[PDB]
Write a protein that binds this ligand. Sequence first.
Ligand code: SF4
Lengths: 628, 290
Amino acid sequence: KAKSIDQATLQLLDKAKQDGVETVWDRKADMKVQCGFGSAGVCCRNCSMGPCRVSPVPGKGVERGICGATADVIVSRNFARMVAAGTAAHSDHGRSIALSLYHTSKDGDIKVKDENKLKEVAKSFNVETEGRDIYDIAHDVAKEGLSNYGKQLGEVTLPPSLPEKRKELWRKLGVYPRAVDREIAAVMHSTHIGCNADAEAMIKMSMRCSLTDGWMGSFMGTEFSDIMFGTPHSIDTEANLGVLEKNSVNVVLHGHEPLLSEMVVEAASDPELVELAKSVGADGINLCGMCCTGNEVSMRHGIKIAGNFMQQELAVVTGAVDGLIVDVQCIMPALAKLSKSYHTKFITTSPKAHITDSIYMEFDEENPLDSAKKILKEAILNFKNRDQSKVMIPELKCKAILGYSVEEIINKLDKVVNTQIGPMQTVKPLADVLVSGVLRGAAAVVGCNNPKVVQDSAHIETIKGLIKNDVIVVVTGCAAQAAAKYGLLQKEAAEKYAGPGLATVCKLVDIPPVLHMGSCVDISRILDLVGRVANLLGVDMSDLPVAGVAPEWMSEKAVAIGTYVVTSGIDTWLGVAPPVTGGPEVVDILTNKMEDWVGAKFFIETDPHKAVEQIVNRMNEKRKKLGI
Amino acid sequence: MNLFQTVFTGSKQALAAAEGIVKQAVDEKGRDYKVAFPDTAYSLPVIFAATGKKITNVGELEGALDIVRSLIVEEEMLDKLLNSGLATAVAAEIIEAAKYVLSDAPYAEPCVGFISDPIIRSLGVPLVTGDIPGVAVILGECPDSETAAKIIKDYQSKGLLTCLVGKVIDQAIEGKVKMGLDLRVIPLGYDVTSVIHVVTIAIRAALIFGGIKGGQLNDILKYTAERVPAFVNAFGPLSELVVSAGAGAIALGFPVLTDQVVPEVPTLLLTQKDYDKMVKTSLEARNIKI
Ligand code: SF4
């Protein structure tokens, strides 16, 4: 099987083979046939009476663990713990953002750059704004956001875009969210030996936990990031490994937390550091981003995107990365080993993510700019250790357009609003094209890479099929970066891949057929958008012809995302089977009974063409239900 | 019934009416009997633009229903909707041709029916010059004669060439609107199919001024969209046939504005209840400068 559809990826894999270094593909091959029990989710290790493995085939072999737990119980608890872990990752990201908001000042390193956005958020949090200092407002907003994480009395605060009907449905179902850390703790408590042994209740607890990610953690992280670093607008950038410069210092930012990458971008324009880069013999400083931190700095500043998850190692294989600065999440620990074969400084900066044999330079949030300058100076000084004979940068990079926040999308939609009719600054043009049938629907393509799928193949095939079927596509994360590398994030792509209705819409609104809405936490934006459409049409989000796809997901964060997208009322297709096939009841809940609960359900489909067909059929049947 | 289904239903009704009237023409006059429009050089302009074929006898008119049949594909995609609008336009043209071959004088005053080529050439000079900054296709009935007269005279005072289809003709007559080719208020006919008589004005504008040869349908549609500043104001309740004819106008690149609640399409299908702002809304939608 081919390892990737990306030619630059293939060239660097040949180079890695020539250099005698191992990749994620090599380790996947070394793992060989993976354990069937773990793959089906019928293995349990929740107590030291175990490990227990029960048969993935009902009626045969061992039926219960030592405590008496069935295959359905073991599967449901394993799934719930994946959701809890994903929720924890996203919530910790949002908590760091809220703490940064709490420390903003007029003369400090972290300021308020979008005051209108802050005032609207303050309105959503019942924070007074009129005749008040902007930083007093910011601190009050940060306090309310922080209380969302750990309040023990009262109800949490949810964005106004969330329909009232969806909230009432959640309350009736018993999944209405509480404080984020409280829900994570509840899931961890109920999976403990001898607690919850009922699959339906376990799945409902996991949905409840995932809601605190989708609508509170990721949402607050995104909106506070907009407040502090600016709301994204349409902006040009370049993507894929070709963005590395042979004659410049190459600094690659990998990870998820945006404050460090924002401070590194600011430090790169420091005159002393630019002079130092010149003095070490480089033309300048070339900042490139990877994964979600790359998505953030690219959405807000046009920083070039070096690559997505399964390309991180290959970035080092070029031999041109002088510094690789990482914060947390989706940072392959093998990088530490791999950087030994090159001059690269692999720099960890977060106390949450220590990696053995990496260079640890703790990013100081109290003095973010000075700390970022010190880290960047280490990366620049490493340019003297470059071995130019080992350097091979593929001449493969692609132009991309991104920055499509909800605000930017609304601004673009204002173009097709007749001034004599109005209203302006709404999602009404999008609602109109969806209701009329010019657009069949909207689909979110999100998720990681996975060695189980030819890298980027499923993302590209799913996106092309959807836009060919007049389904407008919004992309986040590594899927968005796969689209960027391929060339879908271009206005020209409208006439090259889109169907007639979507091509007309793209021409009228002057947008690409695929809209890059940011990082994984920025999936909250997608929720926001859908909610607005629903609120404009007076229906629940489960009545709309919308869907989400995770063609190549790998992370627990992806599991939590799919769970809260389904719980919000949006059908979700998974291109990689989650470890639930061992529990028939869990499969039936996720793919059949969920529709009775929340009006949406999971679809497991490993063939992208079949997934596109199923998405189109499901959207059409929801349209016929809605009468459009 | 959504927009696509409404357009498909309208196109099927137009096809049924065309089949009935063609059967009547075949029964009364014979398949060798001549089929023509008064003083034109492009036979039936819509069929000539779509296929290049000139319809000369009744048998060929009966064989032209296959064009309407092949232009109706009931799949909910935008291209099929535009093709279905074009099917309605072809069916309306066939109905008008059958009217002309059945009756010696199908239209009486003030209705003018078909517009001859010399009138098109006369209007071409002020069209490109800018003395005619647009073509207002008014179809249906306004709630009052006063509002219909007000809108029509507002368009007239702005130099636009306004064409009238339906009961709006009677409302304008009650409103003391002075009509004629020099007064730029042209009543086409009381039936919806009479709107084709302004559609052929645009089509022949591509055939005469644009120089596009017959059968180059995409070139004709591009020319009408980028050169002919026409728009539709549909007043009063809209049947499926009216919506299908509006889909044809959209296929020609002409935006359709109405006072009725319809599934809106930005820049193409717009609802404007306020009759005091309909003229400005249409001028903005068609990008017309006075
Ligand atoms: S919780 Fe039950 S099934 Fe799991 S390891 Fe312990 S005894 Fe075995």
